[PDB]
Amino acid sequence: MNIFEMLRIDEGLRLKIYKDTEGYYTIGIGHLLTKSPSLNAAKNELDKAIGRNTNGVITKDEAEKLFNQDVDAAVRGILRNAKLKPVYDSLDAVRRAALINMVFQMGETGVAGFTNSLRMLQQKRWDEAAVNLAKSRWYNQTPNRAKRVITTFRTGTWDAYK
Ligand SMILES: [Cl-]
Ligand SMILES: [Cl-]
């Protein structure tokens, strides 16, 4: 198991514009297109991202390319963030994957808002961190996914994905 297989399980794959759990236009493997309500604004963002007139449909290769870019960007975002970097540096490999998953889903800013949890992770207080992470809109809105990630931070294993 690795970050790519883990995100692939959590995000699925869709080759046609779809709405995400928050109602926003997305495509591929969790690639957010826009927060705007406009499907036109989304097809415009899609063509811009792929570099062709897509008509709201992409191939598997294109989906995977957006995916590779998005993971790389998430990792680079963590490394450049003063709040996130030290947490990431402190973690083992499995748990680093869980932080990446969170950043991919909610963005750098979103995660950076889990101040108290981040402190507990840094301190390696796993059970406590798991409890605190659950007191969040994130957990209430996407409970199954959040439990998998939380279990990952709790145990330092891939059991939730097995
Ligand atoms: Cl892009
Ligand atoms: Cl869920």
Say how many domains are in the chain: 1
84 is in an annotated binding site: no
Phi, psi torsion values for 22, nearest 5 degrees: -95, 0
DSSP 38: -
Please state how this structure was obtained: X-ray
Phi, psi torsion values for 85, nearest 5 degrees: -50, -50
Resolution of this model in Å is: 1.8
For residues 107, 119, 143 and 148, what is the CA-based torsion angle, rounded to 10 degrees?
Answer: 90
Tell me the CATH number at 80.
Answer: 1.10.530.40
* Catalytic annotation present for 11: yes
Q: How far is the CA of 142 from the centre of ligand 1 (A)?
A: 25
Nearest ligand (C-alpha, residue 149): 2
Say if residues 146 and 132 touch (Cβ distance below 8 Å): no
The tokens of 148 are what? 């998998």
Show the domain range for 42: 1-162
